[PDB]
Amino acid sequence: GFVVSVKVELLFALTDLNAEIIENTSIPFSSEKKPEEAIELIAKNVKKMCLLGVGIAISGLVNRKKGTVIRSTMLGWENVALEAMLHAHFPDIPVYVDKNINCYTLAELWLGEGKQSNNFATVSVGAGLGLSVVINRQIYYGAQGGAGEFGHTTIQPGGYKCHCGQKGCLEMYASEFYFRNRGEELKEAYPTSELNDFHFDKVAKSARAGDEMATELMGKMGEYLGYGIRNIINTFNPEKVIIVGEGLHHRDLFLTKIDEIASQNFFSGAGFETEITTTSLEDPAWLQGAALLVIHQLF
Amino acid sequence: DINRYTVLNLIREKGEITRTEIAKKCDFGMSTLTYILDDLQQEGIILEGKLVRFNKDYGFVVSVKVEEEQLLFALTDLNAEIIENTSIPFSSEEAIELIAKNVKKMCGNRDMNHLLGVGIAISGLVNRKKGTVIRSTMLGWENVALEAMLHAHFPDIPVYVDKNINCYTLAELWLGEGKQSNNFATVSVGAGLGLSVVINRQIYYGAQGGAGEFGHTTIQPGGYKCHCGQKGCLEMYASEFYFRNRGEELKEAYPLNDFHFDKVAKSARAGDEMATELMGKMGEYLGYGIRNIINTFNPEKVIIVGEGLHHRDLFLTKIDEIASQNFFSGAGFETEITTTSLEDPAWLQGAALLVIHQL
Numbered sequence A: 001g002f003v004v005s006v007k008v009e010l011l012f013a014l015t016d017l018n019a020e021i022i023e024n025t026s027i028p029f030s031s032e033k034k035p036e037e038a039i040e041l042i043a044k045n046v047k048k049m050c051l052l053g054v055g056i057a058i059s060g061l062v063n064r065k066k067g068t069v070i071r072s073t074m075l076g077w078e079n080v081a082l083e084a085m086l087h088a089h090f091p092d093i094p095v096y097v098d099k100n101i102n103c104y105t106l107a108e109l110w111l112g113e114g115k116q117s118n119n120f121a122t123v124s125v126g127a128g129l130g131l132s133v134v135i136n137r138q139i140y141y142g143a144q145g146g147a148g149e150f151g152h153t154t155i156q157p158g159g160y161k162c163h164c165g166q167k168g169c170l171e172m173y174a175s176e177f178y179f180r181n182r183g184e185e186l187k188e189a190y191p192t193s194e195l196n197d198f199h200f201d202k203v204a205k206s207a208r209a210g211d212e213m214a215t216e217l218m219g220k221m222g223e224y225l226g227y228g229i230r231n232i233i234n235t236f237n238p239e240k241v242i243i244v245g246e247g248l249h250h251r252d253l254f255l256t257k258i259d260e261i262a263s264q265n266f267f268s269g270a271g272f273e274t275e276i277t278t279t280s281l282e283d284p285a286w287l288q289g290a291a292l293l294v295i296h297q298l299f
Numbered sequence B: 001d002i003n004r005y006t007v008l009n010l011i012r013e014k015g016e017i018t019r020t021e022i023a024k025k026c027d028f029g030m031s032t033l034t035y036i037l038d039d040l041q042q043e044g045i046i047l048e049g050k051l052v053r054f055n056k057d058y059g060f061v062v063s064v065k066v067e068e069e070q071l072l073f074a075l076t077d078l079n080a081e082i083i084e085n086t087s088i089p090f091s092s093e094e095a096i097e098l099i100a101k102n103v104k105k106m107c108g109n110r111d112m113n114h115l116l117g118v119g120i121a122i123s124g125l126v127n128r129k130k131g132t133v134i135r136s137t138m139l140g141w142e143n144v145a146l147e148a149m150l151h152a153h154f155p156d157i158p159v160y161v162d163k164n165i166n167c168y169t170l171a172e173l174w175l176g177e178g179k180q181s182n183n184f185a186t187v188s189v190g191a192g193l194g195l196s197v198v199i200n201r202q203i204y205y206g207a208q209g210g211a212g213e214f215g216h217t218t219i220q221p222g223g224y225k226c227h228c229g230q231k232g233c234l235e236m237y238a239s240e241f242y243f244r245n246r247g248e249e250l251k252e253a254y255p256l257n258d259f260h261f262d263k264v265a266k267s268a269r270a271g272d273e274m275a276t277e278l279m280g281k282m283g284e285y286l287g288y289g290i291r292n293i294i295n296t297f298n299p300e301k302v303i304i305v306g307e308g309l310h311h312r313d314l315f316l317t318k319i320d321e322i323a324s325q326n327f328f329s330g331a332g333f334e335t336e337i338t339t340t341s342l343e344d345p346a347w348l349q350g351a352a353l354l355v356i357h358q359l
């Protein structure tokens, strides 16, 4: 009995019951306010790799009980009954959906750095901020399944507009979003600047090259990530905080900064430290997660 | 083993209940149930009228609140009702001598086999598991072994120490708004900012018993110097400390002398512009703090409480204007935000519930 994990960006993957990626694909497609069509390309590619279930990791708010995507501000999705829209293509196959950061966390819980820690917090640095908090090997969902919305905490009251409708969100300061938000006000202050594409890799690239504007952007993004992690430390008081995500590719330009600040937390004054590490798994562990999503519920 | 517990809880939860009323919601037989009720009866832990009830007076409890200029003390029944309360002054290791001395005064001539325990509410960073106060800026304390030290005088009986906001959270659980809900959050404000989140009717202590220090989350990078060392802590904008930090800079933009909370509040109510601006901004920042708590823990309801102040004096409409603009509200999920229904004594009942809920 095998499983197929899905991830919406689209990423597919065939795995056995140990979450091992046997065969993945990477279909190029944009799902900006396009859910009815996106599901048809999925169900298509899903049957192509061929199955006890399908797991779907995605960016947004989600109600796992009904399997509904309550809200994806990235993709602009409002109340899409994804768990039901797939029974049109696979009636009796159990389908489950979850927050991508909680899918990755399942991966850490069973392959990565969960084999020791029974209670920690995972934070995703990348194109936006994610958080997932484990308690006795259990992901915390809160009352309505929505806990962990840490990227929309206000780090700068009166700050940058955020896709959520609010201002000053952490995600606008402590991720790739920052670069866009702040790179414009830094165009005229840095006229002869190399940089012009404000994505992580481009900014990362210009910054190792010594380009001031990129050096500023990546410096500040770190500070704010340090704040965000320190807010997590002062709030949850976890044994450890694991940083993950495609941002780690450019770790050299932030992890140590993140540490300067986060280490300077409330509880450190009493000798007891809080390990801040990085993920042992690889980028394909988001898919092993979504796969695990179905596997755990089954057993 | 476990059965007594399940029967006994079911008996408090209702206060009064009958044998067959119990049996229904009990995964075992009447023959087993008779054993347990007959034994708990002779223990004196329950009482019969047909109807069986909990013995609030099988035992009694004392709680203690350790403060700046005083030491509170209380003697509750086993429902956490307060039969006797006193207070004694205290400025600043002899604090235990004082407590123990005062403990035995409360009881009067009461039987000492019936004193079931002692709960201590204190401010700062506590490790309830170890019975030690790790840090109390306010008092000038560091790794004090409150439990062990005090155990000297009451070795046969349990001492439990916890952070104020938790002691008051259990109060909410067993007496207030915490009885309806099972996953709420409690915020304190006054002295500084305190937070206790409850998960499955249980306080989240985290890895080393320190979660909830929400007052030192950064809400303004590089802003007002917190007493913690960090800069721009929430607690410097969303609490009585805001007025010390912003008070003097505003005098220049408004020509009020004292910046204690009850002073600013009262002055505002009298229509002073400066006080009003101060009272207004404190409510915004408090509003951000609660919005961050919502996006983070996602509780059923939030409970605001004054510590050394009356929550009605707060600008509740600005707190809620800001707080209700969270991430779950976009998808129309409104989180209930209210003040507490309890009063001052619930801090001391809280510390009594600390001992009571552990039996």
Ligand SMILES: [Zn+2]
Pocket: A151, A152, A162, A163, A164, A165, A166, A169, A171
């Ligand atoms: Zn936002």
Ligand SMILES: [Zn+2]
Pocket: B215, B216, B226, B227, B228, B229, B230, B233, B235
């Ligand atoms: Zn602080």
